[PDB]
Amino acid sequence: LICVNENGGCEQYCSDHTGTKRSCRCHEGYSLLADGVSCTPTVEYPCGKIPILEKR
Amino acid sequence: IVGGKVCPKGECPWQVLLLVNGAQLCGGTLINTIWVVSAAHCFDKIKNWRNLIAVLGEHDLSEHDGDEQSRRVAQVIIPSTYVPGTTNHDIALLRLHQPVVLTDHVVPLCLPERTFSERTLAFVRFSLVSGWGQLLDRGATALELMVLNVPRLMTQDCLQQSRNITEYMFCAGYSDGSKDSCKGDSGGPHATHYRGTWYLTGIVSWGGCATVGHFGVYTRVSQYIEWLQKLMRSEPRPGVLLRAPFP
Numbered sequence: 037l038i039c040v041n042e043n044g045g046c047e048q049y050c051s052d053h054t055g056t057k058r059s060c061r062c063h064e065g066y067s068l069l070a071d072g073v074s075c076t077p078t079v080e081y082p083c084g085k086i087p088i089l090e091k092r
Numbered sequence: 093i094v095g096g097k098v099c100p101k102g103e104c105p106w107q108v109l110l111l112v113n114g115a116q117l118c119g120g121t122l123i124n125t126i127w128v129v130s131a132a133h134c135f136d137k138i139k140n141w142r143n144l145i146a147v148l149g150e151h152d153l154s155e156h157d158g159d160e161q162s163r164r165v166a167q168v169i170i171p172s173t174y175v176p177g178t179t180n181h182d183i184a185l186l187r188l189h190q191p192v193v194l195t196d197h198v199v200p201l202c203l204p205e206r207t208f209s210e211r212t213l214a215f216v217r218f219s220l221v222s223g224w225g226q227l228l229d230r231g232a233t234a235l236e237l238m239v240l241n242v243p244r245l246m247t248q249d250c251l252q253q254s255r256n257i258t259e260y261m262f263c264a265g266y267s268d269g270s271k272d273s274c275k276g277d278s279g280g281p282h283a284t285h286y287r288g289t290w291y292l293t294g295i296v297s298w299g300g301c302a303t304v305g306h307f308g309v310y311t312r313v314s315q316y317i318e319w320l321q322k323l324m325r326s327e328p329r330p331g332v333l334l335r336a337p338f339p
C-alpha cells in the first residue's frame with residue numbers, strides 16, 4: 037500500500053513511511069477508526085459534509 | 093453559471109457571496125469559521141477596502157430567510173506573484189472580522205492536503221462549480237444559487253481540444269457553448285467529492301463565457317495549500333490588503 041495508488045486505501049490523507057509502511061490521517065473534525073483507513077466525524081459540522089443530506 | 097441548475101438550499105453550504113457597497117462582487121468558499129478563499133482579480137478595483145462583506149448561508153438573493161450570516165472582511169491576502177488584470181495566481185485568502193457560526197446552512201469545504209489533492213483528487217473527473225453569476229453570456233445574473241457539474245481536463249488535452257494555461261491553472265467544462273461558469277461566479281468553489289466528503293480543488297477564475305471552442309479556467313488550489321496554511325497560522329496585520337510572498 038502506497039499513497040500514490042488508490043490513495044493507499046485511506047479515506048482521506050495518506051503518508052508514506054520508511055519501509056512497507058503507511059499511515060492514514062483525517063482532517064480536523066474527524067478521527068481515524070481502528071481499521072486504520074476510515075474517518076468518522078467528531079463534531080456536528082465537519083468540513084465537506086452536507087448536513088441536510090447527511091440527515092436525509 | 094450557464095447551463096446548470098438551482099443548488100437546493102443548503103446543498104452548497106460552503107458558498108460565499110462577496111458584496112461591495114451592497115453590490116454583488118464575486119463568490120468565495122468557506123474553509124474554516126474565519127477563512128474564505130476567493131479570486132485575486134475580484135479585488136483589482138476596490139477603492140474602499142472597508143466596505144467588503146462576505147455572506148454565508150445565502151440562497152435566494154430576493155429574500156431574507158434568517159439563515160444568512162454577514163461578516164466584514166478584515167484581511168484580503170493576495171500572492172506576490174499575482175499581477176492585477178491577469179489570470180495567473182488568481183487566488184485570495186480572506187479573513188472575516190468575526191467567525192461565522194456553523195449551521196445546517198453554513199459549513200466549510202475541506203481544504204485538502206497537497207499530496208492527496210495531486211495524487212487523488214486531480215483524477216476525479218467531475219466536480220461542482222457554483223455561483224450567482226450570469227445565466228447566459230451577456231445575460232442577467234441569477235437570483236438563486238446555481239450549480240454545475242464539470243469535467244476536468246489534463247492541460248495537454250485542454251490545449252488540443254481548444255478551438256495560456258499555466259501550472260497554476262486547470263481547465264474544466266465543455267467546448268460546445270452550453271455549460272460554464274461566468275462573470276459573477278469568479279472566486280467561487282470548484283468542489284470535488286471523494287469517498288463521502290467534498291474538497292476544494294479549484295477557484296472560478298476568468299478570461300468569454302460559454303464560448304464555443306473554449307473551456308473554463310480554474311485556479312489550481314493544490315499549488316497553494318502550503319501558502320494558505322501558513323497564512324491561516326499568522327496574526328492579522330493592520331490594513332485590509334496584504335500581499336504575501338509566494339511561494
Ligand SMILES: C[C@H](O)C(=O)NCc1cccc(-n2ncc(-c3cc4cnccc4[nH]3)c2O)c1
Pocket residue numbers: 117118133134135136137177273274275276277278296297298299300301
Ligand atoms: C477593470 C474592470 O472593472 C475589472 O477588472 N474589475 C475587477 C473585477 C471585479 C470583479 C469581477 C470582475 N470580472 N469581470 C469579468 C469577470 C469574469 C468573466 C468570466 C468568464 N468566465 C468565468 C468567470 C468570469 N469572470 C469577472 O470576474 C472584475
Ligand SMILES: [Ca+2]
Pocket residue numbers: 150151152153154155156157160
Ligand atoms: Ca436570502
